[PDB]
Amino acid sequence: SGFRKMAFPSGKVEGCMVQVTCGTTTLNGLWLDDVVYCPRHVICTSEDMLNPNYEDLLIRKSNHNFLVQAGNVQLRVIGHSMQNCVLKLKVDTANPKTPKYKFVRIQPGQTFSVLACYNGSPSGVYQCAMRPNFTIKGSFLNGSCGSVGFNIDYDCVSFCYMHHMELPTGVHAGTDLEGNFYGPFVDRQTAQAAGTDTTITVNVLAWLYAAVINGDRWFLNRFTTTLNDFNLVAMKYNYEPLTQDHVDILGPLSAQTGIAVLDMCASLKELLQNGMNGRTILGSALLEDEFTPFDVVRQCS
Amino acid sequence: FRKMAFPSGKVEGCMVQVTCGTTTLNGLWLDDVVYCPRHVICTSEDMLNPNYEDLLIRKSNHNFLVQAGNVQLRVIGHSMQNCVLKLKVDTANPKTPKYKFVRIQPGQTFSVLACYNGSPSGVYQCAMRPNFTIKGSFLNGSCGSVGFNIDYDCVSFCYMHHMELPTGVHAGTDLEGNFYGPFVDRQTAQAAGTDTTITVNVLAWLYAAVINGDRWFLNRFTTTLNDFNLVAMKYNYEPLTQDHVDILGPLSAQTGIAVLDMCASLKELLQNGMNGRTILGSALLEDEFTPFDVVRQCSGVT
Numbered sequence A: 001s002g003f004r005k006m007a008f009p010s011g012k013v014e015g016c017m018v019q020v021t022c023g024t025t026t027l028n029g030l031w032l033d034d035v036v037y038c039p040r041h042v043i044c045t046s047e048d049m050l051n052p053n054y055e056d057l058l059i060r061k062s063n064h065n066f067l068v069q070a071g072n073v074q075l076r077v078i079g080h081s082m083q084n085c086v087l088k089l090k091v092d093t094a095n096p097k098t099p100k101y102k103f104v105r106i107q108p109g110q111t112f113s114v115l116a117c118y119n120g121s122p123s124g125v126y127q128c129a130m131r132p133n134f135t136i137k138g139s140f141l142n143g144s145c146g147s148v149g150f151n152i153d154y155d156c157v158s159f160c161y162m163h164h165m166e167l168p169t170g171v172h173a174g175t176d177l178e179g180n181f182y183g184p185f186v187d188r189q190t191a192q193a194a195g196t197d198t199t200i201t202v203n204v205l206a207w208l209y210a211a212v213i214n215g216d217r218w219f220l221n222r223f224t225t226t227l228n229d230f231n232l233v234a235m236k237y238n239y240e241p242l243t244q245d246h247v248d249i250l251g252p253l254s255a256q257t258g259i260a261v262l263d264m265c266a267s268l269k270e271l272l273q274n275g276m277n278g279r280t281i282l283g284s285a286l287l288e289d290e291f292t293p294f295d296v297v298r299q300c301s
Numbered sequence B: 001f002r003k004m005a006f007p008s009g010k011v012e013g014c015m016v017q018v019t020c021g022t023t024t025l026n027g028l029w030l031d032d033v034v035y036c037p038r039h040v041i042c043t044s045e046d047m048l049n050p051n052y053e054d055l056l057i058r059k060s061n062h063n064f065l066v067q068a069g070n071v072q073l074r075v076i077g078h079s080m081q082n083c084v085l086k087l088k089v090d091t092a093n094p095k096t097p098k099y100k101f102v103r104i105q106p107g108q109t110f111s112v113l114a115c116y117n118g119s120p121s122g123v124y125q126c127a128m129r130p131n132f133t134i135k136g137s138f139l140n141g142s143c144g145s146v147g148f149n150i151d152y153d154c155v156s157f158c159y160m161h162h163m164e165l166p167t168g169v170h171a172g173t174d175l176e177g178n179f180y181g182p183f184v185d186r187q188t189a190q191a192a193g194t195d196t197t198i199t200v201n202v203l204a205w206l207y208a209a210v211i212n213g214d215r216w217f218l219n220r221f222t223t224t225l226n227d228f229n230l231v232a233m234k235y236n237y238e239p240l241t242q243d244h245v246d247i248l249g250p251l252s253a254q255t256g257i258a259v260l261d262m263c264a265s266l267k268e269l270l271q272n273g274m275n276g277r278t279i280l281g282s283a284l285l286e287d288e289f290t291p292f293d294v295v296r297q298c299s300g301v302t
C-alpha cells in the first residue's frame, strides 16, 4: 500500500547530462551518441535575448566558441546545427552511457519526470504534468535550462521536454527535443502570459480512485450521472471535458474498486459544487490532477 | 515548493536481488558486501514466529543467490547484524559511490528508491514520522529498498524497508539493522502509536513563506523554548530539541526572525487558527520539508 508522487529513476538520464558554455552563458546539455542537445539561447548575450535573431547569431559562431564539459573532461565540438529552438553540437566522442532512447511529443495531461540540473550536474528529480495550457508547473532556478523531462518504459528513455524559460506567474515553458515549444511561447526575454489553465479531469478521477484504493471514501455517493451532464458541470468549473477514451482508460481502476466511472463522476461533480468542507483526500486539501490513470495503476498494481 | 527526490543514479548502481529458496527481495551492494533484510531467510510460515539465529545457522554461503540483473555474485561469507544480513561477495561493486551509514531523527526527510527484483522502479521523497513510520509507497517484493540523502558526492544511507503495518504505513531499519521505532521483523499485529506534527519542519515551512514575501502571520511576541514546547504538545505537535533550534539557524539569519519569535507566531497560529487565510497558497501547514529542504529548493543544489 501507500500513494506518493513518484518519479522514474533518473540514472539513465544523469549519465547524459553535460555543461555547455558560450561566452558568459552556461546551461545544461543532453549528450546522446555523439550529439549534445541544448537550448539555442545559450548563444545569446544578455542584450541578445531581448530580441534574438538566432540564425544570424549562430552563423557568427564557430565550433570553438562552445565549451562542452562532461564532468572534468572537455568534449571537442566538431560541428553544430540548429533545429527550431534546440542547438545540436556534434562532438568527437560517443557517450558510452547512452541509453536506448526516443524523442516524443507529449499531450496535455500526460506526466513525466524532470531531472533538474545546474552546470551539467543533476540536482533533483520530480514528477510534472503537461498542463492543458501547455505550461508546466515545475521547480527551476537560474541555470536550469537544458534540464529534461522523460518517461522510462522497460529500458528505453522517451525524452519529451527540455526546459527554456519561466513565465511571470512562476510556471515554466519549454520544447520537445525537436526544439518546438509546447504552447504559444517564444525563447525571448519578455514577459509572456499563458492561456487560462484548466484542470485535468481524467487525472482527478484517477486520483480519486487511488484515494478509494487507499481507504479514503468519504466523498463517494450513491448517485450517478450521464457523461454529458458531467461534462456540462466540469466545463462550468474550468475542468477539461471527459471523453469516452478517458472513460475507457479508467476501466481498470473502475474494475479494481467496483465503482463505475460515471459513479465516480457523480462524486467529483458533488466535490466541485460543494467543496471539501475542511476535509482532505490523501492528505490534500485540493483535487490533485497530475497523476494519470497509468500512474495510479502502476503504483497501485 | 515541491517534494523532490535526490537523483537516484548512484543508488541504482548498487541495487541487487537476494534470493533464499523462493523468497526474493532487494539488497544494497557496496564494495564487496551486500546488505538486505534478514527475513529473506524465512518462509511465509516462518514469519509468524521466526528464530533467526537458528534459521541462519542452518544456512551456508551456497544457499544465497545474489544477482545483479542476471549476473550472479558468488557469496563468500555471511553474518547477521541486528535485523540486516550482510553477504560478502567475491566482486567489489565498480559503481560504489562514496557513502556513509547514518541513523536519522524523526522529521528528517530522505529519498526512497523503490525496487522490485533488484530493479529500480520509482523514486520519491519521505519523512520519518515522529512515530517512526514512513508514509511510503511499497508493493510486495519492495523489501530491501533503501532511503538515502546525497551530500556533495557522498550517499548517506539511512533506511532499509522491512514491513507494512496494518494502517498501511511502513517500517524499517537503518543500515546497521536497528529498527526505527518499537517494531520487529515478525509477522504479528503491530501498531504504530498515534502520530504528531513535525514542529521543526512546520517552522521551516513558515520561514520559507517569509522568504517568499508571505508574512501576515508574524506577530510582535517572543516565547521561551520551554513554554512553547508545553503549549505545542497540547496541539499534537512535537516539542523542539536544541538540535532543532540549531538547524533553523540559517533560515532565522536569512530572514532576521529569531527562532523563538517564529515559535511565538506558530503558537498564535495554533491557538487562533488560520481564519480562512492561507500560507504559501495552502490552508494546511506542511510538516515534511526540513530546513535543509527549504534551502535546497530555494538555492543551487548540486
Ligand SMILES: *C(=N)[C@H](C[C@@H]1CCNC1=O)NC(=O)[C@H](CC(C)C)NC(=O)c1ccc(-c2ccc3c(cnn3C)c2)cc1F
Pocket (backbone or CB within 6 Å): A027, A041, A049, A140, A141, A142, A143, A144, A145, A146, A163, A164, A165, A166, A167, A168, A172, A186, A187, A188, A189, A190, A191, A192
Ligand atoms: C535557463 N537557464 C533559464 C531558466 C529560467 C531562469 C529563471 N527561472 C527559469 O526557469 N531561462 C531563461 O532565463 C530565459 C531565457 C530566454 C529563453 C531568452 N528567460 C526566462 O526564463 C524569463 C523571461 C522573462 C521573464 C520576465 C520578464 C519580464 C517580467 C516578468 C515579470 N514581470 N515582468 C515585467 C518576467 C522571466 C524569465 F525567467
